[PDB]
Amino acid sequence: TVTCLQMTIYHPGQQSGIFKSIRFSSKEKFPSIEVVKFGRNSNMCQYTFQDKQVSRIQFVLQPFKQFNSSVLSFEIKNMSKKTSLMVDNQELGYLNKMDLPYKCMLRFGEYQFLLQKEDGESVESFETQFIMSSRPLL
Amino acid sequence: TVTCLQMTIYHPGQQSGIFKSIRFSSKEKFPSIEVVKFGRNSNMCQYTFQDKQVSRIQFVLQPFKQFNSSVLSFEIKNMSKKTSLMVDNQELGYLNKMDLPYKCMLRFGEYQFLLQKEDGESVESFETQFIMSSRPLL
C-alpha cells in the first residue's frame, strides 16, 4: 500500500474559484524525492490557489522517515514571509518547520486544512487526495 | 551579509576526476526555496559526482529557521536507499533527516565532508563553498 495524505480543505470563499485548478476526489502519486509546494504561483507550486492573499509559495510538504520506523512521515515548512501558519496551536513563522502527526489542523490566512495520514508499506512513493468541505472545519 | 555553508571534502580518488564538475573556491547563491541535491545524476542534482558508488541522489540539504532564532540553519536528509549516511556519529537510512549544528562531519561511502556554517543576516537566500583537502579529515 502507498501512504496517502488526505487533506480536507475549507475556505469561506471557496466557491469563487480559488480551487479552480485543484483536482479533488482522486489520488495523485509522488516520488519520495519530491517536495510538494502550495501557493499562488503555477510555475513553482504543484497545487495552486487562485487567490492574491496567498504568497507565491505558501508552504511545502515533503516526506521523510522517523528513526527506526518503516513508514513515511510528512514535514511542513512555512514559505510565506507575511502570513503565519498554524499547525494546531503552534505558530510557524517564515522558514519554520515541524514534523506533522497523523492528524493535525492547518490554518493560514483564512484557509483551513484537515490533515489525516493513512499509511502504507511503501517508502519510495506517497499519494495526496483533496476533499472540499462544505461547512467550516473549526 | 549572507549565511554561507562551507563544505570541505576529501576522497582519495579526487585526482581521478570525481570532482571535475564541482566549482571549488567559489560562492554560489541559492534562494531559501531551493533544496540542494548531491548525487550521480546531473539532471537531478545541482552538485554531481562522477563516482558510480554514488547514488542517483545521495542526499539533500535545505535551509530553515529554528524557533525564535532569526538566522538560517540547515537540515540534511539521506536520499540514498542503499548507502547509509553518517552525520558525526549518527547513521541515517533512507529518508532519515537531521538538523545540522554549525560544525559537523559527514561520511558516506569513502567520502568525507566537513560542514561549517558561516552566519549571515539574510534569510532570503544562502550560499555554498567547496574546499578540497589534500589530507583525509579523519
Author numbering:
A (entry chain B), B (entry chain A): 12 to 149
From the primary publication:
Size-exclusion chromatography experiments of T9D/C36S and T9E/C36S showed that the phosphorylation-mimicking at Thr9 is partially involved in the TIFA assembly in solution (discussed later). Although it is difficult to discuss the original effect of pThr9 on oligomerisation even with the use of these results, the crystal structures of T9D/C36S and T9E/C36S provided structural insights into the assembly of TIFA.
Furthermore, oligomeric forms of TIFA promote oligomerisation and polyubiquitination of TRAF6, leading to the activation of IκB kinase (IKK). TIFA exists as an intrinsic dimer, and phosphorylation of TIFA at Thr9 promotes its oligomerisation through the intermolecular interaction of pThr9 with the FHA domain between the dimers.
